Amino acid sequence: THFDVIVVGAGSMGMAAGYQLAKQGVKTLLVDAFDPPHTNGSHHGDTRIIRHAYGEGREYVPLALRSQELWYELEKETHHKIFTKTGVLVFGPKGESAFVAETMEAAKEHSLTVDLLEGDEINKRWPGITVPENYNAIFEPNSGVLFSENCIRAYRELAEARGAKVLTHTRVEDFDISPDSVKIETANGSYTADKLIVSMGAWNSKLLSKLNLDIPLQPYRQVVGFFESDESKYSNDIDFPGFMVEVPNGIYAGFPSFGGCGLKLGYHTFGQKIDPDTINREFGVYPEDESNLRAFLEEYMPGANGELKRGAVCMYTKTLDEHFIIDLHPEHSNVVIAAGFSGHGFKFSSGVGEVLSQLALTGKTEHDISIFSINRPALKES
Ligand SMILES: *Cc1cc2c(cc1C)nc1c(=O)[nH]c(=O)nc-1n2C[C@H](O)[C@H](O)[C@H](O)COP(=O)(O)OP(=O)(O)OC[C@H]1O[C@@H](n2cnc3c(N)ncnc32)[C@H](O)[C@@H]1O
Ligand SMILES: [Cl-]
Ligand code: NA
């Protein structure tokens, strides 16, 4: 059967696209290598931060705010848990964090509700945090934490109820694009449609070449660990925040303990360069997996440095500028590309789904997506 739209990669971005398309009666096929949500891509490890005041650049704020509303809509539509409003704390040494400074500028430019704190005010407000006196902070009370695997699962179940079809455990191997249709090849058969969305996460870095694109898209191995913690300090129940912070040796991001699961941490600015089909997915096979996390905890969050309860291994896919790619294919207006989310895309996946549906159906979007152009110079090596 010929579909209206085919989505290749039914993960964070593709499943949201599928939901958006199905809700409008568009006959959609989604094809995934696995059965999402799963532990082989970029969406597992339970939780994701959503921030509105945005240290990567104030121009992300409108998409973050739209995405936040879309997450509240999803919460109301499903029985799965979507969002909890932890707030997000950002801190770093005063005068020495571009990330903190841009977060602060973004909040001012968009009139976001934030608290500004410094030094011992941080340690007093949130027992369990120990920063130096020369640190400053911005705290965003109304952002928080998404349950990412639940988000994809809910979008899948809602899309399928409206007639979207999901073909699981099926790798797309090649493409054939014509002026008025698209075709995909798999070991389980070939499929056609009017429009294609390409959203294969870390595998975009290997398979966009089949669409005559050569864009730097390096996959990275990124681990997270959950640690036995002082629940009187680090529980969501006592208002411990989500956080993303800059210190001299890089950026870390973490989560309060939910229901006793332990504080979760990741080192965001370091990971191993990998290939998505040979990555070692076991936490702890490199000493740095656990040691880089405890180096942070023992200094800044010392009561959250107990036994390792759980570890996960997940992938980032970076562009050279660490901004996303969301655009039509430059040679094929019936092909939409979502790639290069550079370790910070999940929070936008609801809004991106809307963008991708608009691009597929109309060739345009009401959102300003200029900074995500596939033709920008900053994507290309010298
Ligand atoms: C790994 C990670 C990411 C991350 C994070 C922490 C970790 C450890 N913390 C974040 C946070 O707190 N807040 C946030 O906003 N983002 C954060 N991220 C990044 C975010 O998770 C990613 O940017 C995002 O998940 C990327 O989504 P995308 O949709 O691009 O990738 P995916 O969910 O892995 O989905 C891709 C799908 O494609 C399928 N696939 C692959 N190859 C094929 C072929 N050949 N054919 C068909 N399907 C294919 C995959 O199976 C997958 O389902
Ligand atoms: Cl990513
Ligand atoms: Na984040």
Numbering used by the authors: 2 to 383
Please give me the paper's original passages concerning this structure.
Sarcosine oxidase from Bacillus sp. (SoxB) recognizes the cyclic imino acids l‐proline (l‐Pro), d‐proline (d‐Pro), and l‐thioproline (l‐Tpr) as minor substrates.
The Tyr254Ala and Tyr254Gly mutants exhibited enhanced reactivity toward cyclic imino acids by eliminating this spatial interference. Crystallographic analysis of the mutants revealed an enlarged active site, which facilitated reactions with five‐membered cyclic imino acids. These mutations disrupted the electron delocalization associated with l‐Tpr, thereby eliminating charge transfer and substrate inhibition.
